[PDB]
Amino acid sequence: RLCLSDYSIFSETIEICPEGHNYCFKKFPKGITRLPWVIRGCAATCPKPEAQVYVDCCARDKCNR
Amino acid sequence: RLCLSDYSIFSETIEICPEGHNYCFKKFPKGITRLPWVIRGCAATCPKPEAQVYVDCCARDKCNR
Known about the structure:
mainly beta; 5 strands; dimeric; toxin; Anticoagulant; two-stranded antiparallel sheet; homodimer; CD59; three-stranded antiparallel beta sheet; Ringhalexin
């Protein structure tokens, strides 16, 4: 499985997932619009979210944008 | 298309991409901070990544920094 590490304009950073990891996730904060941190990577299971955080979880190549 | 071959301070090494190659890429390892190798060049398609490697893939002149 291939996930994105970063995504912008069209600049995407691509990684190949470890064995058994077939999910791509994206983590971002809930009340931030003024240039928020965003976290991406591979996962064996959809990451559980934290207090003020959403996690996108998807299962296709380079899906977490 | 023009891609970077090397980039630093402000010293950039510039190349002109072959016909049909309109992507610039950048390849770098995943757990290395202590002066890592970095690979840059032109591409017809975004290079697939390797085990412990990220590949940036972008589509503008001299975009892979």
